[PDB]
């Protein structure tokens, strides 16, 4: 591949100028070894002071790996890169990937390094390996090949990728392969034993066309909108009924015909919170009607690819996290819950960081894009620590919730 | 002649679509012209500048200035216009090391690389943009026109291009001599080592021999400064460091400017002088642009200034960094939302100190502020030492565990240990998770008229207790909090409180221990006095008894 595909930024937009955040000595040393080798292989080159652009870089360890790996925060450059009608009018997102029994994700990021980057755009991929305590100037590089994490890399490589895969795709009409950034999502409907073969069969097929031995295994048959459920009790205290009425009042923003007044009439008077109240039959009926309403799907919920996906996360305690993906309030496209984050029973931020990555992976598989996160955490705590637990080669956007939402109760 | 390597040229462009400067040359006096001709003739003989023809259309004005006793003229070429039209550069000298991160060095020499600066060539295709004109005597001949062949002093790209060229020249010498450090600042290169001073001077002229490859003369710095080094506001001694002397002026009349230049010295001194506090003297700074305003000191402002100068009475120093020892950071609460910290490796020998002030909020608590301080120190330490320090914090391990397991936000602080240094950060109240059996249940509500600001707040309970209080100059949100306050006031040690105020519940669920609002503060003080409080929320106007009953009582 000698020829360059011409790329440029959006109109009236300069290249990124994002400050590099401080790094630990061991991450700096890891990056120095990684970049020295990349320089010898010609993937990157030293740049001079005539390049004022910058994109942040740090070091990562991927799932079950002891090798340091470099990750570039290309979020700004991706925003500023020309909108890619990626060799096409676009590929329709494989709606069938989200319905196949198992999905295996493969890091095919190395394939990018074998195709060259447009000579005029390389300047915009500039990054800095920072020094400690400003004791030397930062080491300044730019890319010569398609870098991992860049919007243009999957687009530019799509012609070669679709060619590499066609023999395997021609053999298997039932395997659905999807590409998002540096990752290949391989989803079949056969059982695990032959599934690890056919990904190894595709794996082994790739190396012949010019890797990482690695993978991740998903099961999108699960991914629904978790129903709202009400308690089933033989004796209701005043407090129980007050919570039920609150939850039903909230649910009535989502569901039509939710009624509360028969349950409200159980609370005639000024009663102690712990006093048991017997349900009337009109209140039992009303509670029953509410139960039936809550088992239907919500009306008029549709994905609009012109709007952002929004993901909210609530810390529920004891390693449990609830989350909802939507585009407009109360029209949940997907809800879920996580428990016992592996290797983090003592670290809230590690758990939250793993939840963000899981939710983003589900969002890629369902809609082919990442959601905008609303994180229950102060900006300064998240910003200090998330890079320590990040393991994906993409990075989504996030905002911070500083007021405790009342609705954490309702997803309990 | 011994061949010398060329210093590789940096390509330079103007800002896109922008052209070079076209500024008129000022008229000068005959004595200034004569001075500029002599000055420019010598730089021309040294290659710095070159004469050009009349085709070049660009121009940048020249000046001649004097000094007090220095009875000589000196050229000034005003590149303000060319700088506005020159591309942005990678300015790679913005950050400067902090002394607490530096390891000690047995020996340090200083070389002057001033002459080296002029052997860095300016990009050939860009020189036309640096053209300037010496006006002629009596304006009777064409003015002498020159352009630069080297980086001009005062031009936008000169510092970045110069330091980049030196760094590239120095890179192989540093890499092949790992037992020395080399640091650039101005026209001076600092070389430190830990080897015996004989091996040091050999490495030094080994470096000069290396610089000769590109033909750069580098003698020792004239009038060699004995320690301490006076550099970026510090005093670098061979084994200790401190800031340059902090002397706090004596004044009967403090103005905005006299006030804001003290906090500067205080902020600068807070990196080594422990316990510096700035809030009260800072507070007088909240909103004024007239810097001559004489605003009196509160006697909390006088107390902390006096509290300062007692800390500034004797000089104190930081130690330099030893990578073989652990890095430890200790924090103290000081009151009114400010915190101090010390970072050290061995007890009583601080690397540096510092302080943290609370973020401007309506409500807050000590644990959140301590957490913020921890993150700031964490980030500072990664900057200075490339690692997170071990923390010593004045909060009990059980207090932190209770806080983060129950707080609605995700939170984390790195490896730390309790240090019993009062005052201790603590949680001041904890709401119940379940209603309290046997405790009185207070149904509270408040309401206000948006126009007349008249309102009511009150409660009704299961034991028939009731109260409604009329209020003036109030809001809906205020009466809702006042209703909760009355219930706390009038209940025993254990109490269930039922509110429909999402506003009140959002404040209390944030767990503040102090507020801008005295009403919230009064509620906090009530919560501290209780043994158990269960706070329940219901939606308003759904006929929830107790809440329906009190809602009618307080709504007009
Ligand atoms: C080497 C150096 C010098 C300066 C001075 C500027 C001025 N004006 C600044 C920096 C950032 C330097 O850069 C590094 N400095 C250090 N350590 C220092 C070296 C100096 N000592 C003070 C001292 C020691 C010995 C003598 S003596 N006995 O020779 O007279 C006199 C003074 C304090 C610590 N470490 C590193 C590591 C990587 S860069 C770098
Ligand atoms: Mg009301």
Author numbering:
A (entry chain B): 4 to 213, 227 to 428
B (entry chain A): -1 to 554
Task: Provide excerpts from the study.
HIV-1 reverse transcriptase (RT) (hereinafter referred to as RT) plays an essential role in the viral life cycle by reverse transcribing the single-stranded RNA genome to a double-stranded DNA copy. There are two main types of RT inhibitors: nucleoside RT inhibitors (NRTIs), which act as chain terminators and compete with incoming nucleotides in the polymerase active site, and non-nucleoside RT inhibitors (NNRTIs), which inhibit the activity of RT noncompetitively. NNRTIs are a group of structurally diverse compounds that bind to the non-nucleoside inhibitor-binding pocket (NNIBP) located ~10 Å from the polymerase active site. NNIBP is a hydrophobic pocket that emerges only when NNRTIs bind and induce conformational rearrangements of the residues defining the pocket.
To assess whether mutations against which RPV loses considerable potency would be susceptible to 25a, we tested the inhibitory activities of 25a and RPV against K101P RT, Y181I RT and K103N/Y181I RT, which were shown to cause substantial reduction in susceptibility to RPV. As expected, all three mutations dramatically lower the anti-RT potency of RPV and cause 20-fold, 90-fold and 1805-fold change in the IC50 values, respectively. In contrast, there is considerably less resistance to 25a for all three RT mutants (1.3-, 8.8- and 96-fold, respectively). With respect to K101P RT, the deprotonation of Pro101 main-chain nitrogen attenuates its water-mediated hydrogen bond with the pyrimidine nitrogen in 25a. Nonetheless, the Lys to Pro substitution places its cyclic side chain in the vicinity of the central thiophene pyrimidine ring of 25a and leads to enhanced hydrophobic interactions. The K101P mutation considerably reduces susceptibility to RPV. Superposition of the WT RT/RPV and K101P RT/25a complex structures reveals that the mutation would remove the hydrophobic interaction between the RPV pyrimidine ring and the long aliphatic side chain of Lys101, and possibly introduces steric clashes between the polar groups in the pyrimidine ring and the non-polar side chain of Pro101. More importantly, Lys to Pro substitution will abrogate the critical hydrogen bond between the pyrimidine nitrogen of RPV and the backbone nitrogen in RT due to deprotonated form of Pro101 main-chain nitrogen and hence its inability to act as a hydrogen bond donor.
